[PDB]
Design a protein around this ligand. Structure first.
Ligand SMILES: [Zn+2]
Ligand SMILES: [Zn+2]
Ligand SMILES: [Zn+2]
Ligand SMILES: [Zn+2]
Length: 115
C-alpha cells in the first residue's frame, strides 16, 4: 500500500501459448491486457486450439475457426471514467463465443491489475 498508481497507461495485448490443463497439449493461448509503463497485466480470455477439448470454445461442428474480435466501451463502476472495455470473441462460421473478462485502463483501476 506504500505503492503508487501508474499515471501513463499505455496498453498492449500480449498472447502466450502454454499447456492446456484439459487436453495437456501445448495449445492454450492466454490473452492479456498489459500496460507497458507499469508492466501490470489482466487476463482477457483463454482458449485452447485442440479440436474437441472442453477448453476450446468452438462448436463440435465448427469446420474452420474464423476469428473476429469486438470492442465495447463502458463507464467504469469503480473509477467513473470512460476507460472500461468489454471485448467480444466469437467465430464467424460456428457462432460460438469465448468467455471474456473486462478491464479498466484508468490509473486507479489498471494499477490493481494482477496476474
Ligand atoms: Zn485443450
Ligand atoms: Zn500502467
Ligand atoms: Zn475503472
Ligand atoms: Zn468456430
Amino acid at each position: 500500500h506504500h505503492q503508487s498508481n501508474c499515471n501513463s497507461p499505455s496498453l498492449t495485448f500480449p498472447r502466450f501459448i502454454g499447456k492446456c490443463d484439459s487436453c495437456q497439449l501445448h495449445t492454450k493461448a492466454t490473452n492479456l491486457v498489459s500496460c507497458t509503463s507499469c508492466r501490470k497485466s489482466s487476463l482477457v480470455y483463454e482458449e485452447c486450439s485442440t479440436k474437441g477439448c472442453p477448453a476450446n470454445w468452438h462448436k463440435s461442428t465448427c469446420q474452420e475457426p474464423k476469428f473476429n474480435r469486438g470492442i465495447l466501451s463502458c463507464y467504469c463502476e469503480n473509477c467513473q471514467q470512460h476507460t472500461k472495455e468489454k471485448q467480444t470473441i466469437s467465430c464467424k462460421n460456428c457462432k460460438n463465443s469465448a468467455t471474456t473478462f473486462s478491464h479498466c485502463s484508468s490509473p486507479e483501476c489498471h494499477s490493481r491489475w494482477s496476474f
